[PDB]
């Protein structure tokens, strides 16, 4: 809960079955290009290869997986320290947002805020964020190397039904923060009690009335048919 | 179905606070080849750490939920083959009694 950054991170395995340059790049939120994994671990702090590979492959006897990770090391080789790895990431905006000191500072923040927002969105938790990114690459390769089976998108345990209460949570939040801005608006106007309790009531009503779970009478894309009239033909119905 | 229910949403911390005091090594201090076969622990897709003998932990966890201490709606699965122990406090999961 709270703001709810629905930022999805992909870890892509470039090059197909029987092609050279089987490189691993990851599309990071608020970043134009797909950054090679090694630059990430380095930008994260994990500077040398092997320290990077330790996070990805755990068994030092799994040569098959490691040979697969060799081109990644090659790709990343260009960048060497934590700083030059962040600068490379800052070079790719947004837009770009010119100035060296600026681009380096960006990427510092994208990692704290946008990158793997769960776990922690705090500061010094690079350790956790790395081991996890690695756990992802590990799972990515495990499938390419025909060991784990490709995830069933339609497995039920992987689904969640949003019931009555959480449907309201999404709605109440949207409107409370809409009141919160009108609250700041009347506090501003006070160059020296007028807090419109209507927005919340009318909002909740509009929503449960139409079924249009959006904001507000200006609907699409809102999500309609959420609420609906209770069928009363028979007690079964 | 007539027996189907939905997870309301509980707190992960009383399980996180428990797990540490039960044999969980924090992820900040992991040595991938020193402790290699270590069963990795996740609470709501957040990788928290590793446990040495998951069989003992899995038995203590199951008993808290079955007694009452850990909420009964809290999902907890141990894949022996995959060497993982994933726990769920997550609101939304459809459950059934058995």
């Amino acid at each position: 809960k709270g703001s709810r950054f629905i930022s999805t991170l992909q870890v892509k395995l470039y090059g197909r079955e029987g092609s050279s340059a089987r490189t691993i790049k990851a599309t990071l939120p608020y970043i134009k290009q797909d950054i090679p994994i090694v630059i990430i671990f380095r930008a994260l702090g994990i500077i040398p290869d092997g320290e990077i590979l330790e996070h990805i492959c755990y068994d030092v006897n799994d040569w098959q997986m490691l040979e697969m990770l060799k081109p990644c090391v090659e790709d990343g080789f260009v960048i060497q320290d934590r700083e030059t790895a962040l600068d490379f990431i800052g070079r790719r905006g947004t837009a770009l947002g010119i100035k060296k000191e600026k681009r380096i500072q960006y990427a510092k923040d994208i990692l704290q805020k946008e990158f793997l927002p769960h776990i922690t969105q705090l500061e010094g938790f690079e350790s956790r964020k790395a081991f996890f990114l690695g756990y992802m690459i590990n799972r990515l390769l495990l499938c390419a190397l025909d060991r784990k089976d490709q995830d069933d998108r339609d497995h039920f345990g992987k689904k969640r039904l949003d019931l009555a209460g959480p449907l309201l949570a999404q709605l109440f939040k949207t409107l409370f923060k809409k009141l919160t801005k009108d609250i700041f608006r009347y506090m501003q106007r006070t160059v020296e009690l007028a807090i419109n309790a209507k927005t919340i009531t009318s909002g909740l009503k509009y929503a449960l009335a139409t079924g249009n779970w959006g904001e507000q009478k200006k609907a699409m894309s809102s999500r309609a048919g959420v609420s609906q009239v209770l069928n009363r033909y028979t007690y079964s119905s | 179905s007539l027996m189907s229910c939905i997870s309301v949403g509980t707190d992960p911390m009383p399980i996180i606070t428990f797990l540490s005091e039960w044999g969980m090594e924090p992820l900040e201090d992991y040595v991938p080849h020193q402790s290699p076969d270590a069963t990795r622990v996740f609470v709501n897709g957040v990788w928290h750490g590793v446990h040495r003998n998951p069989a003992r932990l899995m038995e203590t966890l199951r008993t808290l939920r079955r007694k009452g201490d850990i909420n009964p709606e809290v999902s907890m699965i141990r894949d022996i083959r995959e060497k993982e122990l994933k726990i769920f406090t997550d609101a939304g999961r459809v459950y059934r009694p058995l």
Partner: peptide, 30 residues
Amino acid sequence: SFNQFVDYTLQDIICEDSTLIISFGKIYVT
């Protein structure tokens, strides 16, 4: 579901970015 929403979820949405230059305390439902 609604019970979890009133008893808890509601008290939570009430204070997350609530504090304004004026913050919000405990919520009461008649």
